[PDB]
From Swiss-Prot, chain B:
Identification of the protein by name: Flagellar hook-associated protein 1
Compartments, as annotated in UniProt: Secreted; Bacterial flagellum
Portion held of the full protein: 52 to 101 of 553
Species name: Salmonella typhi
Stated family: Belongs to the flagella basal body rod proteins family.
Highest taxon above the source species: Bacteria
């Protein structure tokens, strides 16, 4: 039943990434602004099953 | 983690300088006086025209 967490984690990270994108759209010509960015990572691997 | 809330407008600026303005003021006043003198002085000379 981990899939619920898998999907919802993906959704949360997607929202975060799009928030970063929107921040960039807002700033696109603000003086000195720097490209803002988000990063990802696989979750930690259990040996819970096969 | 690190985030942002987008963009906001902070101020309105004027392309103004006092010093250049005031030098120009002094020059304009004195020059106006000289040209005003020139205008009348000519009228006297034209009275001698022929």
């Amino acid at each position: 039943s981990s899939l619920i967490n898998h999907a919802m984690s993906g959704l949360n990270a997607a929202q975060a990434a799009l928030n970063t994108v929107s921040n960039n759209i807002n700033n696109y010509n603000v003086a000195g602004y720097t490209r803002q960015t988000t990063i990802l990572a696989q979750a930690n691997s259990t040996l819970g099953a096969g | 983690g690190w985030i942002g809330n987008g963009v906001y407008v902070s101020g309105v600026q004027r392309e103004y300088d006092a010093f250049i303005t005031n030098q120009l003021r002094g020059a304009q006043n004195q020059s106006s006086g000289l040209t005003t003198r020139y205008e009348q002085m000519s009228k006297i000379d034209n009275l001698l025209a022929d």
